Structure formats: structure tokens, C-alpha cells
């Protein structure tokens, strides 16, 4: 036996725990955030600055709080567009999805019907085949064809409309069989961004800023108890208002934006 460090213990416990296999070869401390494949999620102010939603709120049209000055307001005609676009594709069947979303729904299908060894084996061999070049998801084949037509999975996939919403509700159903942590999708974080934050935001009650459409739609069709093909984002826009009247704007960038 010998003395250890961060890198030595990480590279020696890489094998017993597969969810640290994508992160063990890189060096993420020296990198900067908001740049690269491994980037932190955006704040609401940085999101509204990136997708160009901001304007100075005119008087007598959207009434400001008298204790609030030198702040910004969001354009609803652009916010509704970007939050509708932040929804995923339609759900029409499990055989028509992304291959990154065909190896997670099989995991939560194995976990929903108490087959945990198969799901843990899928995640382990998937993390190994991701750290070895390009990941293949055909190891998710024999599970998905077995649990596609069970009663609980068909009820959960019938109570929803969109594919991110279906996968988030599948995680919500599968996490009641114990613990399905959100730390085992560090293979999913480089290959997809919207799906990883939709998996990371479910379980919470406050979502991120890159998935507000899918989370508001998930809440709006978990409250009704009905699928809904119309996008229901009418709360989330208002939610962004409550997250954009909080960061104080210096006057140099307050005079810059236009009404």
C-alpha cells in the first residue's frame, strides 16, 4: 500500500464505480466555465443575455415596483419562442428516439420493474464503451424490447406527450424503487445538454435556465393528469420575470439595451 492523492485515488477507484469513468482522464479545474463540452448551466440573466430577450420596461405598460429601479424586462414574444423551442421532439414511439435517449429509458424501464442488475450492468458497460472511443447503445436492446409493454411503463408513457417529459417522468417513476442518482449520466453530459439538464432538474422543484420549457410543461401536465400537445410554458415566462428583476443592472449596461 502507498500514499494517495486526488488523481491517484480517482484513477484507482475508477474501476469500482463506473460513473467517474468519463471524468477521470480530463482536467476540469484548469478549464474555464461557460466554455467547452463541460460547461456550467447558465444563470437567468446570462440566458436572457445570450438569447436576446431583454428590454428596458417602459412605464404604464408593465408596472414596475417603486422599490425597484435600473433593472430589465423580458420580451414575451421571444421568450415564448425560445421556451417552446427548448422542448424536445415529439414522442411517437420508443423506436424513434435519439440513441442517447434509448439507453436511459431502458435503464429506467429495468429499474421500474425491479430488475436492477440489468440496469446497473447497462450503465457500467455503457460508461466503459463511452470511455473507449464512441459509445454504442445496442446493449440497451434486450431490455427495452422486454419492458416496453408492461403496465406501469405504458401508463407512465401514456400520461405524457414530449420525449424529455416522458424520460423525466420515467426517471420519476423509477426513482421510487430506491435510489437512481443523477451522477451516473456524466456520459450523457458531453453527448447531450438539454436531456442531461432535464434529467438533473427532475426531483427538484426549481429548474435550471436551460430547461424551463420542459420543466414547466412537466409540471403543467403532471398537475392536470393528461397529455398535452400544446406547449404549456405560460408560467415559465413569468418565472423568468421574477428571475430577471433581481440582478441589479449597472447604468453602463442599462443604457445599452433598447425598448
Amino acid at each position: 500500500r502507498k500514499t494517495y492523492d486526488m488523481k491517484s485515488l480517482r484513477a484507482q477507484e475508477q474501476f469500482n464505480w463506473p460513473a467517474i469513468m468519463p471524468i477521470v482522464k480530463e482536467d476540469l479545474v484548469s478549464q474555464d466555465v461557460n466554455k467547452g463540452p463541460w460547461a456550467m448551466a447558465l444563470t437567468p440573466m446570462e440566458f436572457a443575455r445570450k438569447y436576446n430577450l431583454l428590454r428596458k420596461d417602459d412605464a404604464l405598460l408593465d408596472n414596475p415596483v417603486p422599490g425597484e429601479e435600473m433593472t430589465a424586462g423580458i420580451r414575451r414574444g421571444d421568450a415564448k419562442r425560445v421556451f417552446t423551442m427548448q422542448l424536445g421532439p415529439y414522442w411517437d414511439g420508443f423506436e424513434r428516439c435519439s440513441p442517447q435517449a434509448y439507453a436511459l429509458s431502458a435503464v429506467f424501464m429495468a429499474r421500474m420493474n425491479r430488475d436492477r442488475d440489468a440496469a446497473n450492468n447497462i450503465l457500467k458497460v455503457l460508461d466503459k464503451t463511452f470511455v473507449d472511443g464512441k459509445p454504442d447503445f445496442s446493449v440497451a436492446r434486450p431490455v427495452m424490447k422486454k419492458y416496453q409493454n408492461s403496465e406501469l411503463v405504458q401508463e407512465v408513457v401514456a400520461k405524457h406527450a414530449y420525449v424529455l417529459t416522458v424520460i423525466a417522468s420515467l426517471l420519476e417513476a423509477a426513482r421510487e424503487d430506491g435510489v437512481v442518482p443523477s451522477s451516473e449520466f456524466l456520459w450523457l453530459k458531453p453527448v447531450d445538454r438539454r436531456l442531461w439538464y432535464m434529467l438533473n432538474c427532475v426531483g427538484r422543484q426549481t429548474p435550471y435556465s436551460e430547461v424551463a420549457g420542459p420543466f414547466a410543461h412537466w409540471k403543467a401536465e403532471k398537475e392536470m393528469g393528461r397529455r398535452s400537445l400544446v406547449p404549456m410554458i405560460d408560467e415559465a415566462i413569468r418565472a423568468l420575470e421574477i428571475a430577471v428583476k433581481e440582478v441589479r443592472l449597472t447604468p453602463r449596461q442599462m443604457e445599452e439595451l433598447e425598448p
Binding site: 420580451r75 414575451r76 414574444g77 421571444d78 415564448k80 419562442r81 417552446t84 423551442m85 422542448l87 415529439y90 393528461r226 398535452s228 400537445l229 400544446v230 406547449p231 405560460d234
Partner: protein, 202 residues
């Protein structure tokens, strides 16, 4: 130069708005605008400000030069009745009248907005027609239930209840027109009026 069908399609506004920011739809929009002399095919409107290109086959992924046509704000908000009024600018109201096609209603609404906004002595006549248009809007709500006279709620109730067939959709939107509202379209008609009266009288 086709006719206007009030098409409530569920996955059309997402692809349309996703196209509208990209460069292919923008360069094709400039090509069509130079090809068609900024003329709305649906109602014949003619202006440089706030006009947009729609499809004809419903395919918003595939977009060639032939099927992509140009249209005015009213005839282009007619193609997505499931999200109008909630989509920022642009408004609508469902009315019941069989005497007019949707394109003739859009052309007459352009004429009435030109006679209300930039006044030449015919404000009273256009307001007296627009009154009875709003009264027909009130007539619809007795049949289809209270609250769904606005087109966004009607598109939601349509494509949330599971109808995709052209037969049931054409029998449900029969004898129903989409009158564009003035007070939500004030910025566009005042911009068109100010641009025209500063282009002529300078």
C-alpha cells in the same frame, strides 16, 4: 395563390420559429420578397414591413422555392390558429359569417384598418362594420362554449382533444373566419401608415 385554411397543426409553430432565426429561411425570405414584389398572395397586401413566408404543403422542414409563398401578417397568423395572441404580437378573434372567404375578409380588414388608422373621412363606416364583426364574434361563443371565442384557446381545445383528419377539421372550422383584432395590431398598422405617409409626403 392558394386559399386560406385555418389549419390547427400541433408541431408547426416550433419548426416555423426555429426556421425564422436561421439563415436559410432568411435568405430564402429575401429571395421570395424580391420574386413576389412584397405582395401578399393570400390577400394581395403590399408592404415592406412585417411580412413573412409560409409553406403550402405543411412541411416546414423541407422548403424549396416553389412551395414557399409570401403572405401578410393576418394571412400568416391564420395558418397557425393554435398559437395566436399568445405569440407576442399578432392577435385574432373567431367570428361566424358565411358571406366572406377568409382572404376576402383579410382584404376588407386591411381596407377598414386603412380607413380607421389614417383617416380620410371614412372612419365612421369602417367602425360601423367592425362593430358587427365583433358582434358575430360574440355569436360564436354561445355555440362553442364560453371562453373559447379567442383562437388560441380554440386551437388548444382542438389539438388537445385528438383530431388530425382533414374531414373532421374542415367540418369543425366550417363557416368560421378569423378576424384580426385592431387593438393588438396597432403597432403594425401605425407603422405601415407612418411609413407610407412619410414615403409619399416628404
Amino acid at each position: 395563390r392558394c386559399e386560406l385554411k385555418l389549419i390547427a397543426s400541433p408541431g408547426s409553430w416550433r419548426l416555423y420559429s426555429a426556421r425564422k432565426i436561421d439563415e436559410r429561411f432568411k435568405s430564402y425570405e429575401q429571395k421570395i420578397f424580391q420574386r413576389d414584389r412584397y405582395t401578399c398572395q393570400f390577400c394581395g397586401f403590399q408592404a415592406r414591413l412585417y411580412q413573412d413566408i409560409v409553406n403550402l404543403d405543411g412541411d416546414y422542414t423541407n422548403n424549396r422555392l416553389s412551395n414557399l409563398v409570401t403572405a401578410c401578417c393576418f394571412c400568416a397568423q391564420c395558418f397557425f390558429v393554435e398559437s395566436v395572441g399568445v405569440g407576442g404580437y399578432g392577435g385574432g378573434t373567431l367570428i361566424y359569417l358565411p358571406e366572406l372567404t377568409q382572404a376576402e375578409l383579410n382584404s376588407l380588414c386591411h381596407v377598414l384598418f386603412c380607413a380607421i388608422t389614417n383617416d380620410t373621412g371614412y372612419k365612421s363606416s369602417a367602425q360601423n362594420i367592425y362593430r358587427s364583426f365583433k358582434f358575430r364574434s360574440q355569436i360564436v361563443e354561445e355555440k362553442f362554449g364560453e371562453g373559447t371565442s379567442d383562437p388560441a384557446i380554440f386551437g388548444q381545445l382542438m389539438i388537445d382533444s385528438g383530431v388530425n383528419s382533414e374531414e373532421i377539421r374542415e367540418k369543425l372550422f366550417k363557416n368560421i373566419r378569423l378576424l384580426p383584432s385592431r387593438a393588438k395590431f396597432r403597432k403594425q398598422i401605425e407603422k405601415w401608415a407612418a411609413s407610407a405617409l412619410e414615403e409619399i409626403a416628404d
